[PDB]
Design a protein around this ligand. Structure first.
Ligand SMILES: [K+]
Ligand SMILES: [K+]
Ligand SMILES: [Mg+2]
Ligand SMILES: [Mg+2]
Ligand SMILES: [Mg+2]
Length: 66
RNA sequence: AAAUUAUUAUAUUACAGGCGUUACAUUGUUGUCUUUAGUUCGUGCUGCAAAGUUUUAGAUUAAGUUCAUAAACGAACA
């Protein structure tokens, strides 16, 4: 919340990054400006299926998240 | 403009007809049982590879009954 980031506390689905289109394509994306405010522009179906890859991954328990 | 064509009857010959054979040559239908949370496809992942996809020989119910879970995640039909 304080970094405007994302988190996963329940389970890492194997393939979330390598098989992203079969796992995360259905979920909604949004466009934001430099102030992190939603632009409200409707997204083309092309832009809503593209993989959205994290720029940085922080892992609290790496021994259980190989 | 008497020949043509229609119908009908008769005749003619290819045949028609056959509960004749063959359900073990067939269409279709039906009887009986059984498997029917199972197949294939897509992507991902493991193994040099043929292959495998792993927890799990999960829990629960009279029973897929209901639920949980795993490097797997979906889709499609059963
Ligand atoms: K017979
Ligand atoms: K496969
Ligand atoms: Mg005959
Ligand atoms: Mg007879
Ligand atoms: Mg290989």
């Amino acid at each position: 919340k304080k970094t405007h980031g994302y988190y996963v506390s329940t389970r890492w689905i194997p393939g979330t990054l390598t098989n992203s289109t079969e796992i995360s394509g259905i979920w909604e994306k949004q466009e934001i400006d430099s102030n992190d405010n939603p632009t409200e522009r409707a997204l083309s179906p092309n832009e809503t299926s593209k993989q959205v890859k994290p720029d940085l991954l922080v892992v609290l328990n790496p021994t259980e998240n190989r």
